[PDB]
């Protein structure tokens, strides 16, 4: 989501961009502002749901000691789905 | 026997308690509150008038040849009216032991100096005067050591701010390293870390 403002500046995933009259646009003259193009919101949205069989499962990142602490998510609700606090993966049961 | 905890003996404790009784009953005009800790570190506490006699005793006595000054500290405790707790760590080299002599002071109740006993105390007394503001009588030099020459303040006092009251930078108008007042681009972030739970009942203060 690197849409620009009318002032030409890139906007960050923390929607930050300086106003037109904000004098702090000087520092980007003969220069640019570092912004990361790979937004984690859209990326983790570009990730499917991992269906499971149980009402309670666990989540680490996938490396074990290289991910995040083990947490358990309930999957009794059907209208919505589970979500991890550390990562943003989603789960559902059939 | 337990591995995680530190081993413990009793003979050092008994020896140091005996030597504490020794000093206490041999030097009663000055001595207060001899104490020996869990870790066996003897610790004698002294009236400020007793400094030269006690230090000369522990240096020159035969059963106490404490003829080496290791440290000479000070400790600011704003609560007590006599703020600065002054400390004298010593060692013997004849008995392979240490001792700690302590006195107290204030901003306007100075203490006799110790160069007449331990010449090592010269620069330490200078450091203590500079850092905490304790004047020492009949000292040869007694100027600053560590602070800048044009410096007002005794920094290691607890009522002194960590960042100070003046800041330096060079100016082209006068071509000198002028001293402007203090203005930081990021305030020091004080963290409130102490937990609201009695961790050690043994030190529980009653009301």
């Amino acid at each position: 989501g690197v849409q620009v403002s009318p002032s030409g500046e890139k906007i960050t995933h923390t929607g930050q961009v300086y106003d037109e009259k904000d004098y702090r646009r000087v520092r980007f003259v003969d220069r640019q502002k570092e912004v990361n193009e790979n937004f984690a919101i859209d990326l983790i949205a570009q990730q499917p749901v991992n269906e499971v069989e149980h009402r309670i499962i666990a989540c680490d990142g996938g490396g074990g000691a290289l991910g995040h602490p083990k947490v358990y998510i309930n999957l009794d609700k059907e209208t919505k789905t589970g979500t991890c606090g550390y990562c943003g993966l989603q789960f559902k049961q059939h | 026997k337990r591995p995680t905890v530190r081993p413990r003996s009793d003979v050092t404790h008994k020896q140091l308690s005996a030597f504490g009784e020794y000093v206490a009953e041999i030097l009663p005009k000055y001595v207060q509150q001899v104490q020996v800790s869990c870790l066996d570190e003897l610790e004698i506490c002294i009236h400020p008038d007793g400094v030269i006699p006690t230090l000369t005793f522990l240096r020159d006595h035969t059963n106490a040849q404490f003829k080496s000054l290791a440290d000479l500290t000070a400790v600011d405790v704003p609560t007590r009216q006599n703020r600065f707790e002054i400390v004298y760590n010593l060692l013997s080299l004849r008995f392979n032991s240490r001792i700690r002599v302590k006195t107290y002071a204030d901003e306007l109740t100075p203490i006799d100096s110790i160069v007449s006993v331990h010449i090592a105390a010269n620069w330490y007394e200078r450091e203590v005067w500079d850092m905490f503001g304790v004047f020492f009588f009949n000292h040869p030099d007694l100027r600053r050591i560590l602070t800048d020459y044009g410096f007002e303040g005794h920094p290691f006092r607890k009522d002194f701010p960590l960042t100070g009251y003046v800041e330096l930078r060079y100016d082209d108008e006068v071509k000198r390293v002028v001293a402007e007042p203090v203005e930081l681009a990021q305030e020091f972030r004080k963290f409130d870390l102490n937990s609201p739970w009695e961790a050690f009942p043994a030190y529980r203060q009653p009301p």
């Binding site: - | 005794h154 203005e183 930081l184 305030e187 609201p196």
Partner: protein
């Protein structure tokens, strides 16, 4: 020998501070209130002595919080109150003392929850 000094103990000519932070400044002597998140009370029990807060501002580069006073992060601790008044009168600070706030003792009863006549008969358990 001794001397008979009458006047108030004063030290400001020794401390090496400016006239500004001595005269302009105000001091709050107090026991801090317990954090209502934690049921613990050990962060109480010691009289502290804070200073008045002053202008902080956004640093124009990154947005950090800046200051022009060095007494901002200043906190002292005293076992009692008169010690704190003494330290402040000695160092030349005008002080405001907030008295000690102690919770009222209270009469608890696990049997009042199961009364025949009273309104303490809780509907739950």
């Amino acid at each position: 020998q001794l001397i008979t000094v009458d006047e108030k103990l004063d030290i400001t000519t020794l401390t090496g501070v400016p006239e500004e932070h001595i005269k302009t400044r105000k001091v709050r002597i107090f026991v801090p209130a317990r954090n209502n998140m934690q049921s613990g009370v050990n962060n109480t029990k010691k009289w502290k002595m804070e200073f008045d807060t002053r202008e902080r501002w956004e640093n124009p580069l990154m947005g950090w919080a800046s200051t022009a006073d060095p007494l901002s992060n200043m906190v002292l601790t005293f076992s009692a109150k008169e010690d704190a008044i003494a330290f402040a009168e000695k160092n030349g600070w005008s002080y405001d003392v907030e008295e000690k706030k102690v919770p009222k003792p209270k009469s608890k009863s696990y049997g009042a929850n199961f009364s025949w006549n009273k309104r303490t008969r809780v509907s739950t358990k």
